[PDB]
Amino acid sequence: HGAGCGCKISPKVLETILHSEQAKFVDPNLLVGNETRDDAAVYDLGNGTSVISTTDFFMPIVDNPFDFGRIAATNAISDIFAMGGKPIMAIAILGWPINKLSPEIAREVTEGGRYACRQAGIALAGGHSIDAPEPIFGLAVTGIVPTERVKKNSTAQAGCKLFLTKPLGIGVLTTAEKKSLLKPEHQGLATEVMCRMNIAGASFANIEGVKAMTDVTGFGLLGHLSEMCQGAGVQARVDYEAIPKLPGVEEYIKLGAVPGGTERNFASYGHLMGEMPREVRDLLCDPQTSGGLLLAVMPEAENEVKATAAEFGIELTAIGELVPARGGRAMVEIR
Amino acid sequence: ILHSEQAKFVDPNLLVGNETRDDAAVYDLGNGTSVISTTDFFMPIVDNPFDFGRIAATNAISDIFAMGGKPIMAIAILGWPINKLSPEIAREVTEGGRYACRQAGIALAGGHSIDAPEPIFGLAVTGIVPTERVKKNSTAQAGCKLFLTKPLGIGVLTTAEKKSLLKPEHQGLATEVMCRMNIAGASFANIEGVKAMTDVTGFGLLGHLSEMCQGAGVQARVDYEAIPKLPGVEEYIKLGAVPGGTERNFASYGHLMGEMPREVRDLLCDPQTSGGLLLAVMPEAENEVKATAAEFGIELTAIGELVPARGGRAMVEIR
Ligand SMILES: [Mg+2]
Ligand SMILES: [Mg+2]
């Protein structure tokens, strides 16, 4: 009943570079997981177990309060799964304009959060809330991961196949909802895609063959895959059609619903990409709120993994491969 | 105000603190170690950006100490009117936060930020405690003596400075008091006889005390004289200097308290942003608690006691 209060959901609002640069520097340690550019902190307990701490929150992406809460919680929890961790708890983060919106609605948002948490196997353990001019919801999530998984960090490798657990286009569908979103299966499909919890990541990390694992969110596929190629000093080749896509995204893109986030993404990652046709570019730069997992996996597993994806029923999309860096070739090139 | 969690239904363990209200969530790994998570965030409570950062952070970490935990991580919560206030102001607040974090022996590790019409800053903080050493706010028992680790009167000083009623001798005291870290909590956790512990923040001493009593099914008797107060907080309360949050507090729990005069009421219900630890301690451990507190430069005398419930919830040996 109101993604109407946000307002302006892109892209100077969520994690504005400017602000994002405030991680700073340091090395007193036990803290192995975020001192620099990272989106999560990780602390080694020394017994072979590390605690993960991660936070994310935003303004309403959808009009339905329950769904908004589910999605935001799902997105916040994804960060633990994408490092191959297990969430053990979560606490709510809520700003709400009480002089404007009733506490009933706010409760709906929170119940959404609680639902998404239950899907992750945890409880929403309370939280903190304040009066704010614009609604803000998210979580601070805590997790555990074996210390070996973080301390030995692949580093994907040349020869790796590239896999995607969710189709792309979330940004464009939500943008198409601004107006021109059509009634057909373009109703609620983006919500359903966002609310798929990345729970299988925790299992994917128990495999050696998979060299790199990240979640594709907000930097878009271009940004996340480019980041995966930056470490490992390797380039990427992607089949642009193998690429799982939401129903009717290209129609919405060529008809013009592209969030400003994609532009911000192109300004950041565009030089790493070949010169590309506008619609394709808008697809690759599309921020994915609560997107899926990008996997860099090699053959000795092409199936072991695959199995697993099947066990969680996600299975699964091959979009391309990783090649050793060669000259004159783009870091990520599209075919 | 909020109440927005719980709920209808539920999921369970090994969540130890939750969900009624304790200061922080705690989860039991079966290895003798529990993990604590808490978050807190605010709109600016002072002019100085750096000190605002310092204070919001101190307040957020306080809840780990109230559980008797040791802080390990902190992550920033920030929202900022990028078209209104400068990013350099933001870095100053953040720097306040990093400094406070360092005072708790931890790094401020990244965070999340958004554009928000009004400035908001706080932390999500993570801590650890041996499982059997957790100190909930609800586990007190009759016979306990009460202790308080910071003197009262923060709100009255903040509003006296806001109303230009602050005497020159008192400049910046409230800020220094606020920025004192509740680190002693992590040591009180080692005392078997410390039955319960919480922090006094903004709900007022009487509010948090009421939470202890409700939680434990007991009642309290407090001695107004014995309660540590900030210099000229009494005098500043007379012709206050009595912030609007105070009457919100007395509206909330006032029906649970005995008769007390205007000024007394106003001091005891006064919001303390980032205030002291409030402890319930069995007589056998009193000594240890006082000596442990002494290590951290805190001199302690009982402010009252916990008795079996009969009459009104908290009574003041008023004055
Ligand atoms: Mg992520
Ligand atoms: Mg507290």
DSSP B178-206: HHS--THHHHHTT-TTEEEEEE--SSHHH
CB neighbours of residue B25 within 10 Å = 28
| Structural contact between residues A295 and A165, judged by C-beta atoms closer than 8 angstroms | yes
**Token reading at A70:** 């589910």
CA separation, residue A192 to residues A76, A137, A216, A246, B274 (Å): 16, 19, 16, 11, 42
| CA dihedral sign, ordered B222, B223, B226, B230 | positive
One-letter amino acid at A189 equals: L
Q: Using the 8-state DSSP alphabet, how is residue A275 labeled?
A: -
CB neighbours of residue A2 within 10 Å = 15
Using an 8 Å CB-CB cutoff, list chain B residues near A26: 107
All residues at 6 or more sequence positions from A152 whose CB lies less than 8 Å from its CB, including other chains: none
| Structural contact between residues B123 and B74, judged by C-beta atoms closer than 8 angstroms | yes
DSSP states of chain B: ----S--SS---SSB-S-SS--SSEEEE-TTSEEEEEEEEEES--SS-HHHHHHHHHHHHHHHHHHTT-EEEEEEEEEEE-TTTS-HHHHHHHHHHHHHHHHHTT--EEEEEEEE-SS-EEEEEEEEEEEGGG---SS---TTPEEEESS-B-HHHHHHHHHTT---GGGTTHHHHHHHS--THHHHHTT-TTEEEEEE--SSHHHHHHHHHHHHHTEEEEEETTTS-B-TTHHHHHTT----HHHHHHHHHHGGGB----HHHHHHHT---TT--EEEEE-GGGHHHHHHHHHHTT------EEEEE--S-SEEEE--
Does the annotation place A63 within a ligand binding site?
no
Q: Using the 8-state DSSP alphabet, how is residue A198 labeled?
A: -
Residue A128 has its nearest CB partner, among B39, B76, B112, at B39
Using an 8 Å CB-CB cutoff, list chain A residues near B80: 19
Using an 8 Å CB-CB cutoff, list chain A residues near B115: 12-14, 16
Residue A130 has its nearest CB partner, among B41, B78, B91, at B41
How far is the alpha carbon of B224 from chain A, nearest alpha carbon, in Å?
31
Longest dimension (CA), chain B: 58
DSSP states of A72-115: HHHHHHHHHHHTT-EEEEEEEEEEE-TTTS-HHHHHHHHHHHHH
CATH code, residues A152-335: 3.90.650.10
How far is the alpha carbon of B124 from chain A, nearest alpha carbon, in Å?
6
Interchain pair B112, A57: CB under 8 A: yes
DSSP states of A34-51: -SSS-SSEEEE-SSSEEE
CA B7-A192-A225 angle, 5° bins: 115
How far is the alpha carbon of A279 from chain B, nearest alpha carbon, in Å?
28
Ligand 1 centre distance from Cα of residue A101 (Å):
30
Does the annotation place A129 within a ligand binding site?
yes
Interchain pair A126, B19: CB under 8 A: yes
**Phi–psi pair at A311, nearest 5 degrees:** -60, -35
All residues at 6 or more sequence positions from B285 whose CB lies less than 8 Å from its CB, including other chains: B191, B192, B193, B194
Nearest residue to B230 via CA among B197, B275, B198 = B275
Does the annotation place A56 within a ligand binding site?
yes
**Token reading at B310:** 């009969």
Q: Please name which ligand lies nearest the alpha carbon of A292.
A: 1
Does the annotation place A44 within a ligand binding site?
no
Residue A160 appears among annotated catalytic residues: no
Q: Please name which ligand lies nearest the alpha carbon of A77.
A: 1
CA separation, residue B2 to residues A104, B26, B121, B144, B220 (Å): 10, 21, 19, 31, 26
The H or E element spanning position A286 is none
All residues at 6 or more sequence positions from B203 whose CB lies less than 8 Å from its CB, including other chains: B211, B249, B252, B271
Nearest residue to B128 via CA among B60, B33, B39 = B33
Nearest-angstrom CA–CA distance, A207 and A311: 14
| Structural contact between residues B55 and B123, judged by C-beta atoms closer than 8 angstroms | no
Interchain pair A130, B43: CB under 8 A: yes
Nearest residue to B166 via CA among B100, B239, B96 = B239
One-letter amino acid at B191 equals: I
CA separation, residue B260 to residues B157, B201, B222, B267, B269 (Å): 21, 21, 12, 11, 11
Q: Name residue B219's beta-bridge partners.
A: B307
Solving technique: X-ray
Straight-line distance from the first to the last Cα atom of chain B, in angstroms, rounded to the nearest whole number: 31
Nearest residue to B194 via CA among B133, B110, B269 = B133
Buried b (16+ CB within 10 A) or exposed e, B100-133: bbebbebbbbbbbbbbbebbbbbbbbbbbbebeb
**Phi–psi pair at B89, nearest 5 degrees:** -60, -45
Longest dimension (CA), chain A: 60
**Token reading at A76:** 């916040």
How far is the alpha carbon of A13 from chain B, nearest alpha carbon, in Å?
5
Residue A128 has its nearest CB partner, among B40, B82, B117, at B40
Question: Which residue is catalytic, options A5, A117, A160, A229?
Answer: A5
How far is the alpha carbon of A239 from chain B, nearest alpha carbon, in Å?
33
Task: Please name the residue ranges forming H helices in chain A.
Answer: 65-82, 103-119, 147-151, 170-176, 189-194, 201-204, 220-230, 249-254, 260-269, 278-284, 299-311
Q: Name residue A145's beta-bridge partners.
A: A50
Nearest residue to B147 via CA among B272, B276, B278, B294 = B278
Using an 8 Å CB-CB cutoff, list chain B residues near A133: 116-118
**Token reading at B314:** 């908290």
Interchain pair B109, A138: CB under 8 A: no
CA separation, residue B57 to residues A160, B37, B162 (Å): 44, 14, 22
Does the annotation place B112 within a ligand binding site?
yes
| Structural contact between residues A288 and A217, judged by C-beta atoms closer than 8 angstroms | yes
Straight-line distance from the first to the last Cα atom of chain A, in angstroms, rounded to the nearest whole number: 42
Q: Is the peptide bond before A101 cis (omega within 30 degrees of 0)?
A: no
CATH code, residues B136-319: 3.90.650.10
CB neighbours of residue A102 within 10 Å = 10
Nearest-angstrom CA–CA distance, B112 and B41: 12
DSSP states of B223-264: ETTTS-B-TTHHHHHTT----HHHHHHHHHHGGGB----HHH
Interchain pair A19, B43: CB under 8 A: no
- What's this structure's resolution in Å? 2.2
Nearest-angstrom CA–CA distance, A57 and B297: 39
One-letter amino acid at B266 equals: D
Q: What is the CA radius of gyration of chain B?
A: 19
| CA dihedral sign, ordered A178, A180, A186, A188 | positive
Nearest-angstrom CA–CA distance, A17 and B94: 15
The H or E element spanning position A321 is strand A317-324
Using an 8 Å CB-CB cutoff, list chain B residues near A130: 41-43, 120
| Structural contact between residues A90 and A121, judged by C-beta atoms closer than 8 angstroms | no
CB neighbours of residue A208 within 10 Å = 11
CA A136-B137-B266 angle, 5° bins: 80
Q: How far is CA B116 from the centre of its chain?
A: 26
Nearest residue to A82 via CA among A316, A291, A233 = A291
CATH code, residues A1-151: 3.30.1330.10
Q: Where are the domains of chain B?
A: 1-135, 136-319
Nearest residue to A210 via CA among A244, A163, A151, A144 = A163
Does the annotation place B270 within a ligand binding site?
no
CA A43-A50-B16 angle, 5° bins: 100
Interchain pair B25, A89: CB under 8 A: yes
Pick among 3.90.1010.10, 1.10.620.20, 3.30.1330.10, 3.30.230.70: CATH of B1-135: 3.30.1330.10
| Structural contact between residues A261 and A11, judged by C-beta atoms closer than 8 angstroms | yes
Nearest-angstrom CA–CA distance, B49 and B54: 9
All residues at 6 or more sequence positions from A242 whose CB lies less than 8 Å from its CB, including other chains: A317, A318, A319, A320
Nearest-angstrom CA–CA distance, B175 and B163: 16
Nearest-angstrom CA–CA distance, B72 and B186: 12
| Structural contact between residues B39 and A127, judged by C-beta atoms closer than 8 angstroms | yes
Q: Which of A53, A75, A115, A118 to mutate to test the interface with B (most CBs of B within 10 A)?
A: A53
Interchain pair A114, B77: CB under 8 A: no
**Token reading at A155:** 């580093």
